[PDB]
Each structure stands twice: as C-alpha cells, then as structure tokens.
Amino acid sequence: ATFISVQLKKTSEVDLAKPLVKFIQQTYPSGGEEQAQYCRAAEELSKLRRAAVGRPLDKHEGALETLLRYYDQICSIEPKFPFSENQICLTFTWKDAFDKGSLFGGSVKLALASLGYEKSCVLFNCAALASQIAAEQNLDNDEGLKIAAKHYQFASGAFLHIKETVLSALSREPTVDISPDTVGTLSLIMLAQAQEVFFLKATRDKMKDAIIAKLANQAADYFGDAFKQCQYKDTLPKEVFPVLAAKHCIMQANAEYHQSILAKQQYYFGEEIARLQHAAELIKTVASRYDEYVNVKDFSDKINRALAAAKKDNDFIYHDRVPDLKDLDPIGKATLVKSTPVNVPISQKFTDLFEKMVPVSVQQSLAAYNQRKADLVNRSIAQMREATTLANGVLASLNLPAAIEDVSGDTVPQSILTKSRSVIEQGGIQTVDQLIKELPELLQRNREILDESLRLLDEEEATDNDLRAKFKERWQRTPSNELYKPLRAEGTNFRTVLDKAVQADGQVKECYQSHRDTIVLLCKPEPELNAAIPSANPAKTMQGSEVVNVLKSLLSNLDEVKKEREGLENDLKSVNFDMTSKFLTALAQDGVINEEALSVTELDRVYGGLTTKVQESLKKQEGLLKNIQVSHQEFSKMKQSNNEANLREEVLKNLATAYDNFVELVANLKEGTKFYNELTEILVRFQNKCSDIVFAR
C-alpha cells in the first residue's frame, strides 16, 4: 500500500522566442521566407514549456506525454543553436527537489547557462511524474499492474540516464538531486519497486511457491542495495529512508514465508519452522518500528497460523530438528525487470517541429568550405592575370610581334592593326573617357548617401539631450548615443572603405592621362594611323631565316597559351558543388564532422583537374619567355638600322603598351564600377536602417 514516489521540480518561466528568433535573424534575411515557419514553431515551443513545466501538473497520461514530447523537442533542438553558445542568452533556473541537502555554498536554487542542464531536469521531472503515476494505480486490477511496472521501470531508467549524463555535459558541479550518487539511488528504488509488482502478480496468479520466493527476495536485495547506497550518504528526502528499510524487511519476509511452503512439501519440517520464525521476527519488528509507514497486520497472522500449525504438527508428530538460520541454503534471486533506456522519441505521436532546419556543425562547416572555394578560385585567377600581364609586357618591351609583321616600313603591322580594330568598336577612347568621368560621381553619390544617414543619427541624438537636460524626466528611456553603437561602428567602417576607394582611383587617373595620348592613335582609322608612324628602311634577313620563323611559332604557341586562360577562368567561376548533403550524410553517420579531411580531398577532386592545368600554364610561360629572351638576342643583330628605325621601333613598343593599357584599364574600371554600384545598394539598406531606428523612437 506504501510506495516511494518523487515530487517534481519547480522552474521559472523564461521567454523562449526572445533569444531564439534573434538567431533566426542571423539565419534568414527575408520576411515571407521559411524564416516565417521557424517562428510559428518558436512560439509553439514557448507554448509547450509553459503547458508542460510551468505548473504543478494533473497526474494523468497527457500530463506525462506533454513532458515527454517536450523533452523530445529539447534534445531535438540542441544540435542546431547552442553549440558553443556564444551569447545566445536563455539562461535556465531550476529549483532542487529535496531542499535539505547541502547547507554550504549553493543550495535550493541553480541558474546555469547550458541546455544539458535543462534537458536533465525535464527528464528528472518525467521520471518523477511516471512514479507518481505508477503509485496511484490499483494493484488488484490486473491491467493496473502492467501500468505500474511499465512506469517504474521507466522512471528507474529515466534516472539512471541522468546519473550517466550530468558530470559529462554541464558546466560545473550540479545541485543535490541530480548528482550521480542521488539519482543512481532513485533509479534503484524505482527498479526495486517495479520488481515488487512482479512479486505481486506472480502472487495473484497463484504461481509456484518457489518462484514467488525467488522473486520476492530479489526485490528485497534491491531495496537492500538502495539502503546501502544511502546509509552514510547525504542523498536524502526524510521519509524515504525508513520506507526502503521497512519494504526491504517485508520483502525479505515474504521470501522466507514462501520458501517455508516449499520446505514443507520437501518434508524438511525443521527448515519450515526455522524459515517461519525468521519471517515472524522480521514482521514483529516492522509492526512496531515503522507502524506509521506500513500496515502488515494480515500477513502477521498468516505467518503465526502457519507457524502455529507447523509447530503443532512437529512437536506431536514429526519431531524434526530445527536448524540455526546460518545452516540454511540461500533463497535464490530472480529478476524480471530492467531500466527502460532513454532513446528519443519517448513521447508517442512525435513530430520534430524543427525537422526542416539545418544543423549548426553543418552550417558553419558549409560556410568555411565556401572560403576554401573562394581562396582557391580567386588565388588561381590572380596567378593568371599576373602571368599574362607580365608576358604581354615583355612582348612590347621586346617589340613583338610588331617586329616580325613588318614587311615594309610603309604599313601598320597586322597585330597593331588587329589590335587597333578592337580598340575602336569597343567604344574607342570614348568608353574610357566615359568611365573616368562618371566614377568619382558614383563615388560621390555614395558619400552623400552615407552622410545623410549619419546626419540623421546625429540630428536625433541632439534632440534626445535637450529633452532630458530640460525635462522633469518623463523622458527616462535609453540615451540615444548609447543606442547608436553599432550603426556608427559601421559608419566609421564605411568611411575608411571610401577613403581607401577614393585614393584608389587617383592611382588609375594618373596612369590614364599618361597613356591616353597613345590611345588617341589607336582609335584613328588606318590612313592617319599609318601616317603618324615614322616609316623606316626594313632589314632583309627577314625573308624567312630560322632566326625569325622560330619566333613566329613561339608567338603562336604563347599566343594560344594565354588565349586558353579565359576558358579556365570561366570554368573555375562556373563550377559550384552543393556540399550540404555530403556533410549531412557524414554527421548522421559519424559523431561530429571534421571538415578539412573531407573538403581538401573533395576540392582537389572537383577543381583538381584545373589547378594542375593552371600550373601547366604558368610554368610553360617561364619556359616560353626565356626561350624568347635568348632568341631576340640573335635577331637583334640580323635586323639593324641607326636612326630611321629607332623611331619606328620605339613607337610600336609604345603602341603595343598602349593597347595593353587600354584593356588593362577598361576591364579594371568595369570591374570597379560594378563594385561601387553594388555598394550603393548596400548603403540604401543603411540609409533606410538609420531612418527606421529614428522612426523606432
């Protein structure tokens, strides 16, 4: 009639969606996006906690199921936000279950900043509820037993999973009730209490008097061990300690009494008495010493009668020796109970309310792959241009292929021709004058966007002050300058970004004016273009000697080598590999995920076929240019003049450069503008954001 149960644990209501949706700010940038679904569940969870653990609960089924379906959703959420828990602040407060424990340090209450602490307490409450549930139960009704036995067994395991989970998961030393020594003992009591029932069933189904003993015993030898585990340990609620003892004692008395029946059949009439006397003793004790905790009046008669009748028969019929209690065989032990492990889900009709959301050790390793992407792509690109620019630069510094397309001094060589052509219908000088004109304007455009937005902040702040420094303090909310912390932090940054950007274009403007004169030439039609280049008397060891023709095949191979770099720069840009599902598979399969081991070997697999192709380009050039530096050496003599060609030569060198400078300048300014235009828009956000914060006031 008297079963140990465990009172719940009280806890404070904390606003759940407040520090949870703010990470969904960090997550999705759009309203109307899935960001909507993850907040129609964020407040759905806040609803669950309040309904689950906000109250002393109505001992039922759902009351448990809720608590279970909460604990579920908890564990279901932690591999998604509190990994290192940087500042994500939802600190939990939990109150101890058995107040009088430690009167030294921290006692009745503990507020900790770790989810592992939170989940443990819920689970404690689950286990704590299951017990209360299993105790009310009618134990005569046979469907009643089943529910008791299931619940204890569950509570027992619910605790034992805490024991093995606390020290390893928190952030410091834990409160009295949830410490491995405490719970490990409760877990054992539940278990012993479960086992009690099986004795009680087995008893109802009038089973073998041997089997009832062995079952009864093993129950004793469980309460026994729960005593042993309290005896000199402060793990304690007050009335728990004598019950464990009284129970143990009853249990041990049944065990004796049934084994008495067995000994009787086997005609050991001594054993019978010896085992009963022991049994009778055991009860007498309990009758007096724990009377207020257990009623055993009936049982006591059953023994005394059985004893009486046995002592009657033996004294007058059988005359059998009675053994000292030490002389007897151990009653066996038969357990039928095990601690229901804790494997989520524990609730029935389950539904992971955040089933959609993507893990954090995925999200952070997925973004640390995207720099590994950019690094290798951008890095290979940068090796390309610097290789190409250098090459182009040597050619001109060596007058190539201008010198070899020079049949007669009369005409513009064909490369210069083919070049000039490109420069014209690409806009001409006109596209460069365009871009060089409009750029400081687009720079200015942004300076205005910025300072209107910072001025706004400086404007409001000034109003804030005059108000307090003149008011009866009806104005008593946040000092505005303290509120405009990070928006000025950006402000400073946006400035240093522009100061860098302004000076950056002056480097170009200076280059541009010391180069465009020669472009003026390129954009001219052949007539004047041909007329403006000083004509010279051509050297005639150019008819087709091996000194010259060899160079043409170098400048047709180096001609193609740099032409190939486009296709690469394109395929390097074009490739995107969706890494998500490869991490996702490796986190569900294995513990956590080490990204470097996987990404590196994936990259030199995805891109690997190009990195080698890239080093093939660069190192081939080092060859092709050296085998041109030493070859021009020889052509220098076989083609000569004094002053007639010294002009022609050192003009064409400057036009070759002129073209390069043009392409080097356009491709630079387009890529420049197509960056400051991207900034305008990033600053529109910022104009509106400051506006909305001076509207937030």
Per-residue DSSP letters for 98-163? Answer: SSSS--SSS-SEEEES-HHHHHHHHHHHHHHHHHHHHHHS-SSSHHHHHHHHHHHHHHHHHHHHHH
Residue/partner pairs of 162-170 with CB below 8 Å, 24 or more apart: 162/120, 162/123, 162/124, 162/127, 162/187, 163/187, 165/116, 165/120, 166/120, 169/114, 169/116, 169/117, 169/120, 170/112, 170/114, 170/116, 170/117
| CATH assignment of the domain containing 590 | 1.20.120.560
The span from the CA of 555 to the CA of 405, in Å, is 12
Q: 115-136 and 180-204 helices cross at what angle (nearest 10)? A: 20
Q: Are residues 106 and 22 in the same domain?
A: yes
Residues 6+ apart with CB under 8 A from 607: 376, 377, 572, 575
Q: Are residues 17 and 157 in the same domain?
A: yes
Structure tokens at 17: 């969606």
> Chain-centre distance of CA 47, in angstroms?
25
The sign of the dihedral angle between the CA atoms of 161, 163, 168, 172 is positive
Query: Is residue 97 exposed (0-12), middle (13-18) or buried (19+ Cβ within 10 Å)?
Result: buried
The span from the CA of 584 to the CA of 590, in Å, is 10
Query: Is residue 594 exposed (0-12), middle (13-18) or buried (19+ Cβ within 10 Å)?
Result: exposed
Q: Are residues 529 and 603 in the same domain?
A: no
Q: 608-638 and 360-397 helices cross at what angle (nearest 10)? A: 10
From 611, 639, 667, the end of a domain falls on 639
**CA triplet 281, 287, 291: central angle to 5 degrees?**
155
The span from the CA of 255 to the CA of 250, in Å, is 9
Residue/partner pairs of 64-69 with CB below 8 Å, 24 or more apart: 64/126, 64/129, 64/130, 64/133, 65/347, 65/348, 67/122, 67/125, 67/126, 67/129, 68/126, 68/345, 68/346, 68/347, 69/345, 69/347, 69/350
Taking a C-beta distance cutoff of 8 angstroms, is the pair 377, 573 a contact? yes
Query: Is residue 105 exposed (0-12), middle (13-18) or buried (19+ Cβ within 10 Å)?
Result: exposed
Taking a C-beta distance cutoff of 8 angstroms, is the pair 28, 39 a contact? no
Q: Distances from the Cα of 255 to the Cαs of 193, 227, 451, 691, in angstroms?
A: 15, 18, 90, 82
Structure tokens at 79: 């591999």
Structure tokens at 81: 């936000």
Neighbouring CB atoms inside 10 A of 260's CB total: 25
Taking a C-beta distance cutoff of 8 angstroms, is the pair 273, 310 a contact? yes
Q: Distances from the Cα of 535 to the Cαs of 648, 649, 652, in angstroms?
A: 6, 10, 11
Structure tokens at 562: 């740099």
What are the φ and ψ backbone dihedral angles of 90, each rounded to 5 degrees?
-130, 85
What are the φ and ψ backbone dihedral angles of 93, each rounded to 5 degrees?
-120, 125
The span from the CA of 451 to the CA of 495, in Å, is 10
- Among 143, 9, 27, 153, which residue's Cα sits nearest to residue 67? 9
Burial 301-337 (b: 16+ CB within 10 A, else e): eebbebbeebbebbeeeeebeeeeeeebeebebbbbb
Q: Distances from the Cα of 533 to the Cαs of 112, 647, 654, in angstroms?
A: 84, 9, 11
Range of the domain at 193: 1-357
Q: Distances from the Cα of 517 to the Cαs of 5, 79, 521, 650, 651, in angstroms?
A: 96, 64, 7, 15, 13
Alpha-carbon torsion, ordered 66, 72, 78, 79, to 10 deg: -150
Q: Are residues 502 and 554 in the same domain?
A: no
What are the φ and ψ backbone dihedral angles of 130, each rounded to 5 degrees?
-50, -35
Q: Are residues 109 and 77 in the same domain?
A: yes
- Among 95, 97, 123, 133, which residue's Cα sits nearest to residue 111? 95
Q: 546-574 and 608-638 helices cross at what angle (nearest 10)? A: 160
Helix (H, G, I), strand (E, B) or coil at 469: coil
The span from the CA of 389 to the CA of 668, in Å, is 13
Q: Are residues 130 and 204 in the same domain?
A: yes
Residues 6+ apart with CB under 8 A from 281: none
Q: Are residues 21 and 59 in the same domain?
A: yes
Q: Distances from the Cα of 305 to the Cαs of 33, 257, 446, 491, in angstroms?
A: 80, 12, 104, 95
Q: Are residues 85 and 163 in the same domain?
A: yes
Query: Is residue 92 exposed (0-12), middle (13-18) or buried (19+ Cβ within 10 Å)?
Result: middle
What are the φ and ψ backbone dihedral angles of 111, each rounded to 5 degrees?
-105, 110
Helix (H, G, I), strand (E, B) or coil at 293: coil
- Among 123, 258, 240, 231, which residue's Cα sits nearest to residue 193? 240
Taking a C-beta distance cutoff of 8 angstroms, is the pair 74, 122 a contact? yes
| CATH assignment of the domain containing 65 | 1.25.40.280
How was this structure determined? It was done by: X-ray
Structure tokens at 178: 């949830």
> Chain-centre distance of CA 259, in angstroms?
60
Query: Is residue 493 exposed (0-12), middle (13-18) or buried (19+ Cβ within 10 Å)?
Result: exposed
Query: In the structure, how many helices (H) and strands (E) does the chain have?
Result: 23, 2
Q: Are residues 283 and 390 in the same domain?
A: no
Taking a C-beta distance cutoff of 8 angstroms, is the pair 51, 79 a contact? no
The span from the CA of 3 to the CA of 590, in Å, is 43
SS (H, E, C) 453-466: HHHHHHHHHHHHHH
Neighbouring CB atoms inside 10 A of 491's CB total: 18
The span from the CA of 474 to the CA of 414, in Å, is 83
**CA triplet 594, 599, 600: central angle to 5 degrees?**
110
| CATH assignment of the domain containing 414 | 1.20.140.50
Neighbouring CB atoms inside 10 A of 349's CB total: 7
Q: E strands, 432-562, where?
A: none
Tell how strand 92-95 and strand 109-112 pair up: antiparallel
DSSP conformational letter for 316: I
Structure tokens at 101: 């424990």
- Among 653, 438, 664, 635, which residue's Cα sits nearest to residue 551? 635
Residues 6+ apart with CB under 8 A from 366: 579, 580, 583
Helix segments in 14-114, DSSP class H = 18-27, 42-53, 62-75
The span from the CA of 526 to the CA of 418, in Å, is 11
In angstroms and rounded to an integer, the radius of gyration of the C-alpha atoms of the chain is: 45
The total domain count for the chain is 3
Amino acid at 362: V
SS (H, E, C) 547-608: HHHHHHHHHHHHHHHHHHHHHHHHHHHHCCCCCHHHHHHHHHHCCCCCHHHHHHHHHHHHCH
- Among 381, 418, 421, 424, which residue's Cα sits nearest to residue 671? 381
DSSP conformational letter for 39: T
**Euclidean distance between the first and the last CA atom of the chain, given in angstroms as a whole number:** 66
From 639, 655, 678, the end of a domain falls on 639
- Among 36, 578, 49, 4, which residue's Cα sits nearest to residue 248? 4
What are the φ and ψ backbone dihedral angles of 94, each rounded to 5 degrees?
-130, 140
From 336, 357, 378, the end of a domain falls on 357
Q: Are residues 302 and 252 in the same domain?
A: yes
Q: Are residues 139 and 249 in the same domain?
A: yes
What are the φ and ψ backbone dihedral angles of 95, each rounded to 5 degrees?
-105, 135
Taking a C-beta distance cutoff of 8 angstroms, is the pair 75, 344 a contact? yes
Q: Distances from the Cα of 554 to the Cαs of 418, 433, 549, in angstroms?
A: 19, 36, 9
Q: Are residues 98 and 178 in the same domain?
A: yes
Q: 42-53 and 62-75 helices cross at what angle (nearest 10)? A: 140
